[PDB]
Design an enzyme around this catalytic site. Structure first.
Site, PDB file in Angstrom:
ATOM      1  N   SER A  64       0.814  -1.212   0.000  1.00  0.00           N
ATOM      2  CA  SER A  64       0.000   0.000   0.000  1.00  0.00           C
ATOM      3  C   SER A  64       0.835   1.244   0.000  1.00  0.00           C
ATOM      4  O   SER A  64       0.273   2.380  -0.073  1.00  0.00           O
ATOM      5  CB  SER A  64      -0.964   0.019   1.175  1.00  0.00           C
ATOM      6  OG  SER A  64      -2.046  -0.863   0.918  1.00  0.00           O
ATOM      7  N   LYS A  73       0.157   3.770  -2.849  1.00  0.00           N
ATOM      8  CA  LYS A  73      -1.020   4.663  -2.857  1.00  0.00           C
ATOM      9  C   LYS A  73      -0.607   6.137  -2.824  1.00  0.00           C
ATOM     10  O   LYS A  73      -1.332   7.000  -3.351  1.00  0.00           O
ATOM     11  CB  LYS A  73      -1.965   4.327  -1.716  1.00  0.00           C
ATOM     12  CG  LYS A  73      -2.680   3.032  -1.989  1.00  0.00           C
ATOM     13  CD  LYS A  73      -3.245   2.472  -0.723  1.00  0.00           C
ATOM     14  CE  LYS A  73      -4.126   1.231  -0.975  1.00  0.00           C
ATOM     15  NZ  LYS A  73      -4.282   0.333   0.170  1.00  0.00           N
ATOM     16  N   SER A 126      -5.642   3.714   4.093  1.00  0.00           N
ATOM     17  CA  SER A 126      -5.192   2.664   3.224  1.00  0.00           C
ATOM     18  C   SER A 126      -6.361   1.896   2.578  1.00  0.00           C
ATOM     19  O   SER A 126      -6.319   0.705   2.446  1.00  0.00           O
ATOM     20  CB  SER A 126      -4.241   1.739   3.980  1.00  0.00           C
ATOM     21  OG  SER A 126      -3.333   1.246   3.069  1.00  0.00           O
ATOM     22  N   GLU A 144      -5.672  -3.807  -6.331  1.00  0.00           N
ATOM     23  CA  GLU A 144      -5.936  -4.420  -5.045  1.00  0.00           C
ATOM     24  C   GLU A 144      -6.940  -5.544  -5.178  1.00  0.00           C
ATOM     25  O   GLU A 144      -7.860  -5.413  -5.942  1.00  0.00           O
ATOM     26  CB  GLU A 144      -6.452  -3.417  -4.056  1.00  0.00           C
ATOM     27  CG  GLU A 144      -5.455  -2.312  -3.790  1.00  0.00           C
ATOM     28  CD  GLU A 144      -4.392  -2.666  -2.797  1.00  0.00           C
ATOM     29  OE1 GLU A 144      -4.320  -3.803  -2.236  1.00  0.00           O
ATOM     30  OE2 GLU A 144      -3.638  -1.723  -2.516  1.00  0.00           O
ATOM     31  N   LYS A 176       3.387   6.550   4.971  1.00  0.00           N
ATOM     32  CA  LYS A 176       2.458   5.607   4.466  1.00  0.00           C
ATOM     33  C   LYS A 176       3.085   4.227   4.593  1.00  0.00           C
ATOM     34  O   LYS A 176       4.198   3.981   4.082  1.00  0.00           O
ATOM     35  CB  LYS A 176       2.192   5.878   2.997  1.00  0.00           C
ATOM     36  CG  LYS A 176       1.157   4.910   2.405  1.00  0.00           C
ATOM     37  CD  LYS A 176      -0.212   5.181   2.936  1.00  0.00           C
ATOM     38  CE  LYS A 176      -1.236   4.132   2.548  1.00  0.00           C
ATOM     39  NZ  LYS A 176      -1.061   2.986   3.453  1.00  0.00           N
ATOM     40  N   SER A 177       2.343   3.351   5.216  1.00  0.00           N
ATOM     41  CA  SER A 177       2.794   1.989   5.485  1.00  0.00           C
ATOM     42  C   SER A 177       2.153   1.033   4.489  1.00  0.00           C
ATOM     43  O   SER A 177       1.335   1.436   3.681  1.00  0.00           O
ATOM     44  CB  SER A 177       2.432   1.618   6.906  1.00  0.00           C
ATOM     45  OG  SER A 177       1.027   1.683   7.100  1.00  0.00           O
ATOM     46  N   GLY A 178       2.589  -0.222   4.498  1.00  0.00           N
ATOM     47  CA  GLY A 178       1.978  -1.242   3.651  1.00  0.00           C
ATOM     48  C   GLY A 178       2.180  -2.573   4.324  1.00  0.00           C
ATOM     49  O   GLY A 178       3.123  -2.748   5.085  1.00  0.00           O
ATOM     50  N   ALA A 179       1.324  -3.517   4.009  1.00  0.00           N
ATOM     51  CA  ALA A 179       1.377  -4.813   4.528  1.00  0.00           C
ATOM     52  C   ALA A 179       0.803  -5.701   3.452  1.00  0.00           C
ATOM     53  O   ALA A 179      -0.051  -5.309   2.738  1.00  0.00           O
ATOM     54  CB  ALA A 179       0.538  -4.920   5.770  1.00  0.00           C
TER      55      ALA A 179
END
Ligand SMILES: [Mg+2]
Lengths: 263, 223
Positions: free
Chosen positions: A45, A48, A105, A141, A209-212
């Site tokens: 993510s 984004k 997110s 996604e 901004k994080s993502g997993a």
């Protein structure tokens, strides 16, 4: 001063998985330190932000509008769509959709936004055109989070992501209100508590901004600095680990604590 | 007061680890490696022979000259001098090799011609150890990698450069026996990685603690 690098290495050893990291000076763009900066990792993510960069760039060139409304139909709702699942009736503007994609997110928001620009291929074109010849988005996604080992789809490198982020947030690629809107959306991120924000001291600014994703994949991109002002960019990614999400979170947070301490 | 370093994967040319890799530092003895590179390029070009003997006077001896000081009578071959200049950091040997290519400016132009526009040698030994005579960790590593992989030198010369450099942590093959270090890491005769470290400042110890901390940060291509 290599202490942070030794900690990244320990993280890699604790997770049993590749970790990549780079820290860049926001003003000069000079690399301050790095660990596996030119290895490919899934973006998840974190893409984004780049997406909303392309959406903002089109807003600046007159091809999109912040206030344009989008209706969408329950069938579009992919998992983790917390904001978009509340506006089945009235819809959502571009501005709200960027807000949901960044700050929360929201996955459906990202897909809707991807459709506005012509999909993954057009995001990738937008990137190549701004000088990033590494970063590639290929899927939508939630498929882009699969993180299959050795699959180069939907990946970046920590150095390419860091440089790209820098160009988005500074200089003239975007307009002043656009630059500021993107950084404000990143400042207002509400779903990256466990990562670098858990180590951020009082009064520091962070825009992130994080993502997993699947297969142990986790990361973050951030602009941060002391005294309410960003001065550096940090990008951390990992993939492959069988550790829990909380252990991955912890590792990233401890790298953050180290780079803060040795700032 | 300042430290900068970089480790590169030789096969890929990817940066593995870096810390201030674009800060400028005095080359100190690390120029000797690149000099021996320019020398071997001349050999490859049929313009120099490693077996060629050179005689030199006692008007050529400068500080730290452990090999050359002993051969004023019989001289030393180009190959011997290269071995002396890298392995023993023999400063006269570096000055004599420099004369064989055409001075600092001809090394600097060698570097320009292979894509390196950051690293500059201007002086001779010993004057080069006082923005002249500088590089960055990334430029020196990137240049060394060009020397050691594919293209620039024949396979003979590449192996020769390596074998001189492989002629501080026990795992490191250190070229040289305010400071610069070049180390190769990997199997004997075929390193997989290179490390370049500069430090300007200092107390025998604490530099050694810093070096050990850098050692702790080093990695390899993930398999
Ligand atoms: Mg390793």
């Amino acid at each position: 001063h290599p202490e942070t690098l030794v900690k990244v290495k320990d993280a890699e050893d604790q997770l049993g998985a590749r970790v990549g990291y780079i820290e860049l000076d926001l003003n000069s763009g000079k690399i301050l330190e790095s660990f596996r900066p030119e290895e490919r990792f899934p973006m998840m993510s974190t893409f984004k932000v780049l997406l909303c960069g392309a959406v903002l760039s089109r807003i600046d060139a007159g091809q999109e509008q912040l206030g344009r409304r989008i209706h969408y139909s329950q069938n579009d709702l992919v998992e983790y769509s917390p904001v978009t699942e509340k506006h089945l009736t009235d819809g959502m503007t571009v501005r709200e959709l960027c807000s949901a994609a960044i700050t929360m997110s929201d996955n459906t928001a990202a897909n809707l936004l991807l459709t506005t620009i012509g999909g993954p291929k057009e995001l990738t074109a937008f990137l190549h055109n701004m000088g990033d010849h590494v970063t590639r988005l290929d899927r939508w996604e939630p498929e882009l989070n699969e993180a299959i080992p050795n699959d180069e789809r939907d990946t970046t490198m920590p150095a390419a992501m860091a440089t790209t982020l820098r160009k988005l947030l500074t200089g003239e690629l975007l307009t002043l209100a656009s630059r500021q809107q993107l950084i404000d959306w990143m400042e207002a991120d509400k779903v990256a508590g466990p990562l670098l924000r858990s180590a951020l001291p009082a009064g520091w600014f962070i825009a992130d901004k994080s993502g997993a994703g699947e297969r142990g994949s986790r990361g973050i991109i951030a602009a941060l600095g002391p005294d309410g002002k960003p001065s550096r960019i940090v990008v951390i990614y990992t993939t492959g680990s069988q550790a829990t999400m909380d252990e991955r979170n912890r590792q990233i947070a401890e790298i953050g604590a180290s780079l803060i301490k040795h700032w």
